């Protein structure tokens, strides 16, 4: 009609997809410990005591992980925090010298101290002696240390070794006061932006979400780092979800998300002693002087029955996407040590656990129910000190030994699998999945799959019958 | 589970003609041409997009479970074997002759 005029509405509920800078927010209770944690440092603003989550009822929004910029941002922050925390620490340039290593000799009895009989660390470490520099440059001292065989590579003239990193890059020594404990991080938006949250219980990565809600900060996200199994995560609400960018493309990793947590219990039974030498002015090197008392390979404990079930429900979901084919799990076919073994952290000691008993099975048809009694699965693990977790992108690190015995109990929340292709043999009613794959980004897609950053547009133009009164 | 089949095994198109080769594919499809004992090169990827470098002579189009590779203004140097490729499944192809 002629009676309609342009009216300006302020405060309209409208948004667009956008990308912005998310800042950190962490709980104060985890703060004021003076432990100088790497990840959620003092710079994070205190979290809101009363978070607001608003359910938007008649709203359908298109969500798409695998294209979420919240994941790429978290990658930059995680690497950036890692590098700066290591900047003030001590370089280990003087340790790139020739090492003369021999078999370790120890004094104890310690008749295995427990049921497991995996083995002993002897034949897994070497006793290496070398020349370093005293605080005075023109004086050299001969010292010794116990190095893991994984950290030393023989060059020539047998019984003469060197550290692995000495031909790739220099490695800094993690400062003693630095803590590796992952504490939750809340990613928040500036004013004028918002985060949409998908509340659907059974929701894959992409597609419309009919139960969107509005928040201002994500839930606490732990930066826990792992390779084959996601640990200490958040369980699924409805049931097991198989999420993959394209299940047809075998180059894309499959993320399995569990609705029932499975405990993994890892310990380092040995008893290492931390001793320090001076390699230069103001530079001190922490080494494993001796290992007295208990000597046994590190291991992880898994309840056998729980894994069977958790492995049995998963194949149930897999059979839906692969209807007429049998599903089998196999150990990784090769790659770096981070790919072929379950890599994680525990009190600053970096583990590499085998996990072949967990991923060696075949599920032909489930013709009959097979029953077995409870057993504990012991996974042999190895410890490493020269650490390169960012695929040769960040700063290499040397982890000083931790005094005493080490024990860590953590949940298993998901699995990263990698289906293998084929033309004729692979089509003979069989599908093999192998653990591990992707990168560290997928360790955080599993947490940020339900979020989406948008920008608010509070200005609205509408036709009404109200006309501005001219003077 | 990818199903593909190239019905024309071989054909004898003359010089200067326009000839179409059809490949069915349940997924992404790419087009390669390979000379006698040489490395195949990419002409059309996704079934419609032209590669940077191939002349405008080559072109293909899609409708349903069927793709077409069209070579208008055939040349004596455009004689080779042509592939329709899905992720890891490849068919023998078709060979050209005058």
């Amino acid at each position, epitope marked *: 009609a002629e009676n309609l005029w342009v009216t300006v509405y302020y405060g309209v509920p409208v948004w667009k997809d956008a990308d912005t800078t998310l800042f950190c927010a962490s709980d104060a209770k985890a703060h004021e410990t003076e432990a100088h944690n790497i990840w959620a440092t003092h710079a994070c603003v205190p979290t809101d005591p009363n978070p607001q989550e608003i359910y938007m009822e008649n709203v359908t929004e298109n969500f798409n992980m695998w294209k979420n910029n919240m994941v790429e941002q978290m990658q930059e922050d995680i690497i950036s925090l890692w590098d700066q925390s290591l900047k003030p620490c001590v370089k280990l340039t003087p340790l790139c010298v020739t090492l003369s290593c021999t078999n370790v000799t120890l004094t104890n009895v310690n008749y295995t101290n427990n049921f497991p009989n995996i083995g002993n660390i002897t034949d897994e470490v070497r006793n290496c002696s070398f020349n370093v520099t005293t605080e005075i440059r023109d004086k050299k001292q001969k010292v010794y240390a116990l190095f893991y065989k994984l950290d030393i590579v023989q060059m020539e003239n047998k019984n003469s070794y060197r550290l692995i990193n000495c031909n790739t890059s220099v490695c800094k020594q993690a400062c003693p006061k630095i803590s590796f404990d992952p504490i939750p991080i809340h990613y928040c938006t500036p004013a004028g932006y918002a985060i949409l949250k998908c509340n659907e219980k059974n929701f894959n990565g992409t597609g419309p979400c009919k139960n969107v809600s509005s928040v201002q900060c994500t839930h606490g996200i732990k930066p826990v780092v792992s390779t084959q199994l996601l640990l200490n995560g958040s369980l699924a609400e409805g049931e097991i979800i198989i999420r993959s960018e394209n299940l047809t493309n075998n*180059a894309k990793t499959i993320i399995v998300h569990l609705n029932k947590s499975v405990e993994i219990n890892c310990t380092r039974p040995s008893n290492n002693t931390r001793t320090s030498v001076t390699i230069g002015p103001g530079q001190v090197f922490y080494r494993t002087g001796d290992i007295i008392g208990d000597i046994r390979k590190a291991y992880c404990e898994i309840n056998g029955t729980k894994w069977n079930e958790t492995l049995k429900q998963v194949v149930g979901k897999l059979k839906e996407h692969f209807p007429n084919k049998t599903i089998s799990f196999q150990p990784p*076919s090769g*790659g770096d040590l981070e*790919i072929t073994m379950h890599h994680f952290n525990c009190r600053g000691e970096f583990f590499y656990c085998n996990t072949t008993q967990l991923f060696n099975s075949t599920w032909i048809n489930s013709t009959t129910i097979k029953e077995y009694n409870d057993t504990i699965i012991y996974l042999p693990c190895k410890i490493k000190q020269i650490i390169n977790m960012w695929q040769g992108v960040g700063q290499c690190m040397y982890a000083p030994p931790i005094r005493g015995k080490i024990n860590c109990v953590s949940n298993i929340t998901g699995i990263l699998l990698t289906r293998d292709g084929g033309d004729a043999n692979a089509t003979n009613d069989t599908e*093999t999945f192998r653990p591990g794959g992707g990168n560290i980004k997928d360790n955080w897609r599993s947490e940020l799959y339900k979020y989406k950053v948008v920008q608010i547009e509070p200005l609205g133009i509408a036709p009404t019958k109200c006309k501005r009164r001219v003077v | 589970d990818i199903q593909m089949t190239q019905s024309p095994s071989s054909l004898s198109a003359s010089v200067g003609d326009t000839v179409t080769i059809t490949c069915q594919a349940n997924g992404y499809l790419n087009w390669y041409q390979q000379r006698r004992g040489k490395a195949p090169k990419l002409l059309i*990827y996704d079934g419609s997009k032209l590669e940077r470098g191939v002349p405008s002579r080559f072109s293909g189009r899609r409708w349903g479970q069927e793709y077409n590779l069209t070579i208008n203004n055939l040349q004596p140097e455009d004689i080779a074997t042509y592939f329709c490729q*899905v992720y*890891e499944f490849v068919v023998p192809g078709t060979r050209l002759d005058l």
Partner: nanobody
Amino acid sequence: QVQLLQSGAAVTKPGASVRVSCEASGYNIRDYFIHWWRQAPGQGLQWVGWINPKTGQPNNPRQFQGRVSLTRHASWDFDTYSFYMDLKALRSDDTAVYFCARQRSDYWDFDVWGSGTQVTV
């Protein structure tokens, strides 16, 4: 430019092993998968597997399990890479030409191919 330099042809005996090498120099090698293709004489191409250059993780069909071992070696500054392919047990069926190809995107576009290495027994 971008180039995938191959090695020369190889002649071996049944039951022996072979080592085919492919070298990539002129791009960011770490961000693109490298696939290996097998073309028997008088037949079409066959897929051998892909290797993740960042982590070295391989992936092969059931046919090539326990025989093919895909490994890569990276320069100090990652300017150039060397990709290797090893066959453990050889038969008459393994005579073919082996190509190293550079997948470009999720379409599996192999824009760059190696010259080819003739392996015969």
